[PDB]
Design a protein around this nucleic acid. Structure first.
Ligand SMILES: Nc1ncnc2c1ncn2[C@@H]1O[C@H](COP(=O)(O)OP(=O)(O)O)[C@@H](O)[C@H]1O
Ligand code: BEF
Lengths: 111, 563, 88, 96, 98, 95, 111, 84, 99
DNA sequence: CATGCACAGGATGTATATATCTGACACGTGCCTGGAGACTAGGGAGTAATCCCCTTGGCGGTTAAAACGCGGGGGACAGCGCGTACGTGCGTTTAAGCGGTGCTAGAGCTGTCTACGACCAATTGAGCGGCCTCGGCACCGGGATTCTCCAGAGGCCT
DNA sequence: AGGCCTCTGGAGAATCCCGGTGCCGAGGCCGCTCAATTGGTCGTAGACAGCTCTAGCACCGCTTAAACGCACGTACGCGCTGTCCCCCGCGTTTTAACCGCCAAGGGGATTACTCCCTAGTCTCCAGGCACGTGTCAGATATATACATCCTGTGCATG
């Protein structure tokens, strides 16, 4: 006579999977035992960061008159912001270029 | 009734009026008729005459017959790079009233030829096109795509034995009315690779791959009550079905009964024994110590002294098989790093280290005593270099062909050597590069320095000196190393032939070996083994010559083809 | 009739050739290059490679395998101090 | 024989994308990079929380440790929005 | 006479191009040979997957690029525009790598 | 009052007297040594944990410790540490 | 009937405490199991490193005709040696001072 | 319950001179001091802002040396001589 | 007789040789303590500082500044000058990856 | 006739050597808490046996970078001259630094009691392998627009 | 008679968009099953109230070393010129990567089966940790001998 089952994610309103996060947190021996509130808190943060980066990536990709995102777009989106750049100060992205810039002294004279 | 010659002449004139270079042979005329019938019925087909029977002239006659009726059209011929000049010369010789061009060279030259000789509008002056594989592969998409190819001839068909081959995919861009696929060895190592040619030639029939796989049984089930005689019954039924489903699409003829005027040939194996120098390397390699063959303090209070500790006042099995094969071929292939750019060792030292080289040196001296000429085959160029250096030291003449020699240089040397006035007597060839197509009737002896994994490759190489136009008996010597890994590979190789003999007919505790392999050939036996008298053609009415030497003996063994 | 001199190949480290170094420099934003950098760059690169190959080999050895794999290189890089995305 | 399955965040990342740019798509390489990013962030946060809990001799992990770890790691403005999102999620979850 | 640019013009044009592309710059086969040579010293008869070689390449290339970028600033500091070895040595010394 | 706190004080003094018979140490140096030992121990254990985790193992055995040392200590120090560890373990079993 | 107890450190021949290391490993939640062999290895390694540092420190101290070690001596011993300096690349020792060093260009002209 | 203001001026020039000498500097310009004071303030802010966060979590009201030594270790520099 | 006076630059070398031998602390106590107290007043209003933490903070600050000046001095010699200037500090901090 | 080297003394700033006298550092006890013998279940981990993938060695050909060589402009170094912005000293001021007393406030222990979170069985369905089908991109080929680079005329002079 | 130049005024070379066919990687669809859910105990970390009692935060006074302003020289920083070698740009060829293609077989993953190390309880007892004393290194005071930095005649101009 058990009622219809509803996933915890649906109950909380998030998109990421609560159960998988809880399982990983337990089996990873990060602590002796895990409270009931942590996975819900963690999933929201992960979702927020993912959406934050994807919005800028999509804007940059659209600006170039193209439909599908590719790593160059991620590089441009990340390195043009002063906060995401500080968070990822040590990470390297495969097949990403570099921001274009030239020292002012090297440019030719006005003539 | 008219004689055979007169009837042949009249029929040739009726069918091939433009052909003027020379008369066709009877079976060639029959093949021409077969091709004409196949074309009339609108069905493709393979031609698989044995090597050296003159397929090129038959194809040329067929083409002349086609154009003889005014059916001008764009014709394409594809062949290996080394043979193109031969195709051009044959056309120039037998049918002087036809034009052809060798569409080969750099991009600019190809564009020049396209603009000059190949007008967009077909006409009686349109020449035949000849090309290699790579050129036909690169330019298929954007140049050759723009013609209505009337007829296509793909020489050396066995190059398409893989259904995943890229070349087999590029050709789909072209649209061809009919295909013809010449070859000399239709049946490769395993049955699957045979389906590719049939699928390419007749897609409307041999569609399903799994059906072709399942149509023949190779289960080898135990001889149960219902299977005791099935071992032979099923085999016979399968062979009969295969022949019956292959009869209408293939033409095959054999030398042994078509050209009885041609002298025969024999294949001979001769063994050699390893030297102590090679045994040392073998032992070191087995123990994983070849490189080695070529190759604490206490601080006060008793503690160990750390190395380079400052003492100053403070104030103020991975690749064993290939290694063994290299060792068996010749020791010097190894240790290629010790001397770097420096010279090869002294001439006399090279001979003393390799058994096979010693045997070859012993064998060569006698052949020159009777004015014979020999061809030497090999697979590894670095091995060719050592022989070249040795012969240069001895001061003999040499000619060489391989992948690094350009087209014009290849062509010049063949013509020079074919000259009767040439004094050259040694010719070197790479197995893959020069083994196909070319004609070297001048020589009458072939030597195989090593054996390939695929037996079919050797068969092509042996026939380069035994074809129409030959006038003397031919001997083939194959060298091997006694009691070594070489035997294993050679034994495995012949295992693939039994399937060919089963499928294709001739028309449409020391063992005994341990008592023979080890034994080196003595000088007295060697000087006796060179007799070729029995292979000569007997005069009419005379008895056959007796066998010159027994089938097998110490250090040598004749090979008899399966039949 | 080839002469008695063996074939020889350039040393492996020489494979990295001058035009490649020039191309690398341009991406950095360099306009003029001196003549001696081509001997410093190779020395720097050879030193850099060992500090990663050693750790990769140690990780492979511990697992009792005989073939290196991508995860070993990624772990070595991450431990050394640099993180790499796109190969996990 | 296909038993060796693999788990990843591909489906969820794809789901989130359609909420911001409905008509856009993403190639495989970008998907792999995005997948790798999430693992790194999760590992950092969990690792920090683990040692934060032990420092006080407490045994369990609760939302308080996660909140403090997030406040420590993320720099500048990102901290405030993340914390607000987390609290807004948990409060809604508890009431139902 | 034939058209001929003044010194320095082509370098800027090359810079403005190579900063737009993401492809690899060093040739593959020589790099693979070098990687195989170095590792063989520590242990014999290893085997490499292709993706490992690719990872090593793309890891080293982005390190060399950054090193060259940090070097250029030092040259401008001393009132020059050319790079010289002392610049690389100083940059590495300050970075703390030696 | 008087709630005990644990440290490595005695053993450092024992080793010192074993090396230099007549030398002594002030308290400040003792504190530095006490911190240094803990730091090294933590580094080694932390490395060993993940090294074991990567291979789906559950236990931590001497092999993990031996592998971990070769990654941390640079060059020469690696050899002698491994030698000492092997000697100690070998002697322990036969006792 | 009980045999007289012998400490594990005594049987292994070391000086450091084996038991305490074993207790620390289990309570540290590094893994769910600990082998019987690890503590001995770890104790031996720690003892060797401590002896190595102290031997150099003592030599440094005796040079200045002192008798008891002080932090300056540890600083000198650590920074003068090669491998130890690399190992302690990011460690600050309280009241350590710095090594004597003057750039050659600053010295007075020899004339 | 008093208030504090403008204490950054307390880093007198001779103190900066003495600090410089230990580093091996011979001759000093006139504009260094203003840059040095700003650098020092920027450095101190980050350490203090993490020490406070560590303290407040445990609900204590007094900062202790263990918090400070913990804070430094997170930024890649370790301190020996106060705890572990 | 003129009042005996050394040539410029001599006393600097004596100071360098002297201060590199001792291990004292160079900044005053009370000014640094007041500076530390002032900054923390922004994050919380009534913090109570244990007497030991201030020493640790002072040690860390001195150890950082000494290394920064040492690197700046090397950066200065590169241009053939001998006096350090703000450009050198800015370049050093840019290279180290802090800015 | 205004230079470049050799010495003289002669004022200062270190390291000798001898004598006083603290207050840490070393050593003893007396307990306790935590380590050390026996005993008993369980299940990771070691060890065969086996597929099927993916790696390792070599030849053929092309063709687009790679190597050489030559001209010539400009950037890297020496030199010299000018003029500040620092570096030794000497008085005058100001704030650390030491040495004692009071208080509370807030950090540590001790003894309860309860809501929270591990474990087990029985359920489904949300999440993963395969497999087609089509458009976003990927060539091509051809006409624009930008941008350098050098020669002649005449401002305004000399 | 002769400059020094803008300002053209072209002339040549490099991206740049614009339209037209081909193609294979992304997006749904399907089938299957193993990992979250839902109820249920049971013992426990962790709030919570009530007490000690250590130290950090003030206050006062007093000596007295560091700060803080000047007023000189001087040696370094900066700019302007010349000279000369070296790096860039552009033409001819030669050399080696990229694929394409032949073969083979080592080592990576699974799936069963069995056993011997580790966990978790009990006793039992001795090794390490606060309190307690007692000397003697090392921090200061003083006399001074020695080493080091600086300027003023000396020589040689000739
Ligand atoms: N009818 C002929 N008259 C003269 N020579 C002929 C004739 N037919 C064939 N040949 C010879 O056959 C030789 C090779 O031709 P061919 O058999 O077709 O080569 P392959 O079969 O190996 O591809 C040629 O040298 C040619 O001289
Ligand atoms: F085409 Be044939 F074999 F020359």
């Amino acid at each position: 006579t058990r009622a219809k089952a509803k996933t915890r994610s649906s109950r909380a309103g998030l998109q990421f999977p609560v159960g998988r996060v809880h399982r990983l947190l337990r089996k990873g021996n990060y602590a002796e035992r895990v409270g009931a509130g942590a996975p819900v808190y963690l999933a929201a943060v992960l979702e927020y960061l993912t959406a934050e980066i994807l919005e800028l990536a999509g804007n940059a990709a659209r600006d170039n008159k193209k439909t599908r995102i590719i790593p160059r777009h991620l590089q441009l989106a990340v390195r043009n912001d002063e906060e995401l750049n500080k968070l990822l100060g040590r990470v390297t992205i495969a097949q990403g270029g570099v921001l274009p810039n030239i020292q002012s002294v090297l440019l030719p004279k006005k003539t | 009734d008219l004689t055979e010659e007169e009837t042949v002449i009249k029929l040739q004139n009726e069918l091939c009026p433009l052909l003027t270079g020379g008369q066709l042979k009877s079976y060639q005329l029959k093949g021409v008729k077969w091709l004409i019938s196949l074309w009339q019925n609108g069905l493709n087909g393979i031609l698989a005459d044995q090597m050296g029977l003159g397929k090129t002239i038959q194809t040329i006659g067929f083409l002349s017959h086609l154009k003889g009726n005014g059916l001008d059209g764009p014709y394409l011929v594809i062949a290996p790079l080394s043979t193109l000049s031969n195709w051009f010369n044959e056309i120039a010789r037998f049918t002087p009233s036809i034009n052809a061009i060798i569409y080969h060279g750099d991009k600019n030259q190809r564009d020049e030829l396209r603009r000059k000789h190949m007008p967009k509008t077909v006409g009686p002056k349109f020449p035949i096109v000849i090309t290699s594989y790579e050129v036909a592969m690169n330019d298929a998409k954007r140049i050759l795509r723009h013609y209505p190819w009337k007829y296509v001839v793909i020489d050396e068909g066995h190059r398409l034995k893989n259904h995943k081959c890229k070349l087999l995919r590029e050709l789909k861009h072209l649209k061809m009315d009919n295909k013809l696929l010449l070859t000399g060895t239709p049946l490769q190592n395993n049955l699957s690779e045979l389906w590719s040619l049939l699928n390419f030639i007749l897609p409307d029939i041999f569609t399903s791959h799994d059906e072709f796989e399942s149509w023949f049984d190779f289960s080898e089930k135990n001889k149960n009550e219902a299977t005791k005689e099935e071992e032979e019954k099923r085999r016979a039924q399968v062979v009969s079905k295969l022949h019956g489903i292959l009869r209408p699409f293939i033409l095959r003829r054999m030398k042994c009964d078509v050209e009885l005027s041609l002298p025969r040939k024999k294949e001979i194996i001769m063994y050699a024994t390893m030297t102590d120098h090679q045994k040392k390397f073998q032992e070191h390699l087995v123990n994983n110590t070849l490189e080695a063959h070529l190759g604490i303090e206490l601080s006060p209070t008793g503690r160990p002294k750390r190395r380079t500790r400052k003492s100053i006042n403070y104030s103020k099995l991975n690749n064993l098989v290939i290694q063994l094969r290299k060792n068996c071929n010749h020791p010097d292939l190894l240790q290629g790093q010790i001397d770097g750019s420096y010279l090869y060792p002294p001439v006399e030292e090279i001979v003393g280290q390799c058994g096979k080289f010693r045997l070859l040196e012993r064998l060569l001296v006698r052949l020159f005593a009777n004015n014979h000429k020999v061809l030497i085959f090999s697979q590894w160029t670095k091995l060719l270099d050592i022989m070249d250096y040795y012969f240069s030291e001895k001061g003999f003449e040499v000619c060489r062909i391989d992948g690094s020699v350009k087209l014009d240089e290849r062509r010049r040397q063949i013509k020079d050597f074919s000259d009767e006035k040439s004094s050259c007597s040694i010719f070197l060839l790479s197995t893959r590069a020069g083994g196909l197509g070319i004609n070297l009737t001048a020589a009458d002896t072939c030597i195989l320095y090593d054996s390939d994994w695929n037996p079919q490759m050797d068969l092509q190489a042996m026939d380069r000196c035994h074809r129409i136009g030959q006038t003397k008996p031919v001997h083939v010597y194959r060298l091997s190393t006694a009691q070594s890994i070489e035997t294993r590979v050679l034994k495995r190789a012949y295992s693939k032939l039994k399937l060919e003999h089963v499928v294709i007919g001739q028309g449409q505790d020391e063992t005994a070996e341990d008592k023979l392999i080890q034994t080196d050939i003595s000088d007295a036996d060697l000087d006796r083994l060179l007799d070729r008298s029995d292979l000569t053609i007997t005069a009419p009415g005379e008895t056959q010559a007796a066998e010159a030497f027994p089938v097998k003996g110490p250090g040598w063994e004749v090979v008899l083809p399966s039949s | 009739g080839a002469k008695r001199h063996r074939k020889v190949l350039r040393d492996n480290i020489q494979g990295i050739t001058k035009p490649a170094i020039r191309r690398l420099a341009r991406r950095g934003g360099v306009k003029r290059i001196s003549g001696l950098i081509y001997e410093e760059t190779r020395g720097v690169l050879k030193v850099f490679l060992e500090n990663v190959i050693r750790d990769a080999v140690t990780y492979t050895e511990h697992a009792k395998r005989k073939t290196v794999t991508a995860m070993d290189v990624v772990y070595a890089l991450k431990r050394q101090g640099r993180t790499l995305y796109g190969f996990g | 024989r296909r038993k060796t399955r693999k788990e990843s965040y591909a489906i969820y990342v794809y789901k989130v994308l359609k909420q911001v740019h409905p008509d856009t798509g993403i190639s495989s390489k970008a998907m792999s990079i995005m997948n790798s990013f999430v693992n790194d962030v999760f590992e950092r946060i969990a690792g920090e929380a683990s040692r934060l809990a032990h420092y006080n001799k407490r045994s369990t992990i609760t939302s308080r440790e996660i909140q403090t770890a997030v406040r420590l790691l993320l720099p500048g403005e990102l901290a405030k929005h993340a914390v607000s999102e987390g609290t807004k999620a948990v409060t809604k979850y508890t009431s139902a | 006479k034939p058209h001929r640019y003044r010194p320095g013009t082509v370098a800027l044009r090359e810079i403005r191009r190579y900063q737009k592309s993401t492809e690899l710059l060093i040739r593959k086969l020589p790099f693979q040979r070098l990687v195989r040579e170095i590792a063989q010293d520590f242990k014999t008869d290893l085997r490499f997957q292709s993706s490992a070689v690719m990872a090593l390449q793309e890891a080293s290339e982005a390190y060399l690029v950054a090193l060259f970028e940090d070097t250029n600033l030092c040259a401008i500091h001393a009132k020059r525009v050319t790079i010289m070895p002392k610049d690389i040595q100083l940059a590495r010394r300050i970075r703390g790598e030696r």
